[PDB]
Amino acid sequence: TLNGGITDMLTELANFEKNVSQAIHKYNAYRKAASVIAKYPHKIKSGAEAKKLPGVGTKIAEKIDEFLATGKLRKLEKIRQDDTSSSINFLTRVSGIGPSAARKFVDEGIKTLEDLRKNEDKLNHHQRIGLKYFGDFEKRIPREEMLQMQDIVLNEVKKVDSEYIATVCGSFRRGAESSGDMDVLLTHPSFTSESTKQPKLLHQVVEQLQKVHFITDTLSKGETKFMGVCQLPSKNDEKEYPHRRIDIRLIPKDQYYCGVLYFTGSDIFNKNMRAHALEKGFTINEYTIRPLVAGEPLPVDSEKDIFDYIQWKYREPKDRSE
DNA sequence: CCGACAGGCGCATCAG
DNA sequence: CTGATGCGCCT
DNA sequence: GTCGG
Ligand SMILES: [Cl-]
Ligand SMILES: [Cl-]
Ligand SMILES: [Mg+2]
Ligand SMILES: [Mg+2]
Ligand SMILES: [Mg+2]
Ligand SMILES: [Mg+2]
Ligand SMILES: [Mg+2]
Ligand code: NA
Numbered sequence A: 001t002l003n004g005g006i007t008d009m010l011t012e013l014a015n016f017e018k019n020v021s022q023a024i025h026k027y028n029a030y031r032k033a034a035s036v037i038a039k040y041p042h043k044i045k046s047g048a049e050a051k052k053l054p055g056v057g058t059k060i061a062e063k064i065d066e067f068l069a070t071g072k073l074r075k076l077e078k079i080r081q082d083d084t085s086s087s088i089n090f091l092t093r094v095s096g097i098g099p100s101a102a103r104k105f106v107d108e109g110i111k112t113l114e115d116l117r118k119n120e121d122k123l124n125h126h127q128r129i130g131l132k133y134f135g136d137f138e139k140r141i142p143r144e145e146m147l148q149m150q151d152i153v154l155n156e157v158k159k160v161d162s163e164y165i166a167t168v169c170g171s172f173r174r175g176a177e178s179s180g181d182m183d184v185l186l187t188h189p190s191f192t193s194e195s196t197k198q199p200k201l202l203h204q205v206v207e208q209l210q211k212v213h214f215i216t217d218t219l220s221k222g223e224t225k226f227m228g229v230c231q232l233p234s235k236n237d238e239k240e241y242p243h244r245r246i247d248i249r250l251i252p253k254d255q256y257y258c259g260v261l262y263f264t265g266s267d268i269f270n271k272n273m274r275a276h277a278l279e280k281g282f283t284i285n286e287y288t289i290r291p292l293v294a295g296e297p298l299p300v301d302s303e304k305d306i307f308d309y310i311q312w313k314y315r316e317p318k319d320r321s322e
Numbered sequence B: 001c002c003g004a005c006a007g008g009c010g011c012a013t014c015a016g
Numbered sequence C: 001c002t003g004a005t006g007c008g009c010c011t
Numbered sequence D: 001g002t003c004g005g
Helices: A004-019 A024-039 A047-051 A058-070 A074-081 A083-091 A099-107 A113-118 A125-132 A143-160 A201-211 A253-264 A267-279 A303-309
Strands: A165-168 A182-187 A215-221 A225-230 A244-250 A282-284 A289-291
Touching: A004 A024, A004 A058, A004 A074, A004 A083, A004 A099, A024 A267, A047 A058, A074 A083, A083 A099, A113 A125, A125 A215, A143 A165, A143 A182, A143 A201, A182 A201, A182 A253, A201 A215, A201 A225, A201 A244, A253 A267, A253 A303, A267 A282
Parallel strands: A182 A244
Antiparallel strands: A165 A182, A215 A225, A225 A244, A282 A289
16 A cells, blocks of 8 residues: 555554553554554655654654655564564453453563464463464455354344344454454344333344354343354365354443444444534433533434534445545 | 543441 | 453454 | 653
C-alpha cells in the first residue's frame, strides 16, 4: 500500500507501547496515526506533510522524517534486538496472554512456545486453548469459508428456534475478502431491554453448535457473550480446516442497531465514532445512544439514526474499515 | 498547558 | 459469600 | 503521543 512502510512502523510502535510499555494511550495514539496515514491518498514525502493529519504530531512526524531518510527507525531497531521486549511481544500473540502475563512469564524464564508448552499448568483455561491453537488462530479465514460457517450457524440457530436472528458482523459484514475470526450477533424476541422472557437463550445456541461439532472449545461464556473455537467439517481424505475463533453476542432485540453498529466495527471506526459522539454530547455503547452523566436512551430504529444524532453522513459497513 | 483519550463482558483475584 | 479491581478480550 | 479549548 501507499505509505505501507510508515504505517507498519507505526503499528510496530503501537504494539511495543501496548505490549512492553503497557501504555494504552500511546498504543492508541500510534494506531490513530497509522489509521489516518493509511487513508491519506498521497505518497507521504516528509514528516511535515504527515503532521498536517489529525493524530500525527511532532514526535511521529520526526519518526517519519527518519524513516523516509533512512528506511528504518533506530528506536525500532533497538526494540527488535532487545531480547526481553521481543519475548514479551511474542507471548502476547497467544490469545489470553496480554502484556501483564507476558511480562510475568518472561520474568519466570518463559520465553518461547516450547516454554509455554512445558508449563501448561501455569496457564489459565483461555491461555491453554490459545496455546493449543496458536498456529491456527493466526491464519485468516477466506470469505468462502466464512460463507460456509455462516450457513452452519444460521441453519443451526434456526433449528433451535425459528425466532432467533443471527447476523454475522465484524470484517465479514464490512465485505472483507478474508476475516480473522467470526463474529455473530444474536437476537431473540424473548430478550429485550425490558425483559428476559426465556432463560438460557445463548446457552441453547452454543449447545446446539457443540452437538453438531461446530464449536470445539470454549474460551469464555456468560449470559450474553460467548468466546470460543469452531471448525468447518472436512470431507473424506482432506486435511482438516484450521480451528477458528468465534464470538457470539446476544443483544436485546430492541437494541439491535446499536449492537450491530458495535459488532460491525472496525475497532478504530468505533473508537472514532464514539469519540465524536462525545464531542457532540452523546455516549454510544453496544446497547444505546444516550445524551450526556448519561441520560436516557434515544430512540433508534436504524444504524443511520445513530449517525444522524452525531451529525455524520451514513457510512456503509464496507466504508468503516481501516 | 493539560485533561481526556470508547465502552464493557467474563473471568481471576483480593479484602473482608 | 459480596463488591471492587484490573486483565484480556471484542468491535 | 496528540490536541482542543
Ligand atoms: Cl483500544
Ligand atoms: Cl446502556
Ligand atoms: Mg494475547
Ligand atoms: Mg479484530
Ligand atoms: Mg472478527
Ligand atoms: Mg471476534
Ligand atoms: Mg481496560
Ligand atoms: Na497533526
